Curated annotation (Swiss-Prot), chain B:
Disruption phenotype: No visible phenotype.
Binding locations of substrate: 45-48, 109
Enzyme nomenclature, EC number: 3.5.1.88
Organism expressing this protein natively: Arabidopsis thaliana
Similarity comment: Belongs to the polypeptide deformylase family.
Gene behind the chain: PDF1A
Protein known as: Peptide deformylase 1A, chloroplastic/mitochondrial
Boundaries of the shown chain within the full protein: 79 to 267 of 269
Amino acid sequence: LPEIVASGDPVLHEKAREVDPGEIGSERIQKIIDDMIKVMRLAPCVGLAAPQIGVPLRIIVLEDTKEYISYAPKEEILAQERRHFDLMVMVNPVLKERSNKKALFFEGCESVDGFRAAVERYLEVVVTGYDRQGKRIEVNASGWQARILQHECDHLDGNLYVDKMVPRTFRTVDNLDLPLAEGCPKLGS
Amino acid sequence: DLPEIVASGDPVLHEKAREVDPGEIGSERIQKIIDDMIKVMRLAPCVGLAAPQIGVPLRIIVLEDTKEYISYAPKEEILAQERRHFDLMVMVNPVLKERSNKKALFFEGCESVDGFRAAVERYLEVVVTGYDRQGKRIEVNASGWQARILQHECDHLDGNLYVDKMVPRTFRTVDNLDLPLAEGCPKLGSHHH
Ligand SMILES: [Zn+2]
Ligand SMILES: [Zn+2]
């Protein structure tokens, strides 16, 4: 299995290339997708983008499970509108917001080990693209799944969350629960 | 007992520190804070420290760049960064202002963000007014790397960290420091001067 690439590796900070839709069913692409799913599940994390394993292609994978959700308190899950969703593979995803509704919560990324920051995201999105088999799909998502989609689509354009985080919120994982500083907007929606 | 460096997340790093009463700078209490900062800075080791980084909500900075520290860096880097040794400096209630519009771009780290670096644009030339550790009124004129350190440390006193003013797509682990800059990133260096 490929290792998750850390911030600084140019592949993370460069625009990923579209996959030829007719090649999605190929050995080469299926292997990249298989590797991404295994890497994601090994971390474990709820989302991964191809550049994170050193592959400059427009591919994301994502899932949120009863198990992952069980590691957070009910009150946080409720606030974050965080709900299970089946494994999703999107090739050449194109994301657009469904409304102007936004929420602010702490995010992390496997390519930035040991830190989190508060990131404003759209609450409702639509993402078009291709599935694992090369069939055209349209995904409508809200709440936490929508945030995951934006985070992972961002990686395809060489964009990390640290370059669009709310000022004065960046923090170590151990400091996650400390108050927000004077003047910071409050978490939630 | 020597204080530990406070890490990003603790509100003392992210809020505005208060001035020291000038008449109190010479007191044992403030001297102790300053001695603690110096020991913590040298322990890391690093070239600058601000009081909020040891959990003290006061406007005090210390900084030091020794011939020894500088001996480790590449000759070409030292030249580009205009990085020259300077003796231990303490300023209380510093007030920083630029002396020209000339800027430079290089990588910075902060002990309060362990394990990462990013490229940050700074003024090449600054002047800082304030008090020394005995409470005497002073002015400090700096350029190159010393000017950068002054800006970074003064920023801490207003609850500002480099990560909120870094060039996009340059944030990186220390181990990846030397990897190439991605396309569209500005090159490291300085305006002609
Ligand atoms: Zn990520
Ligand atoms: Zn610092």
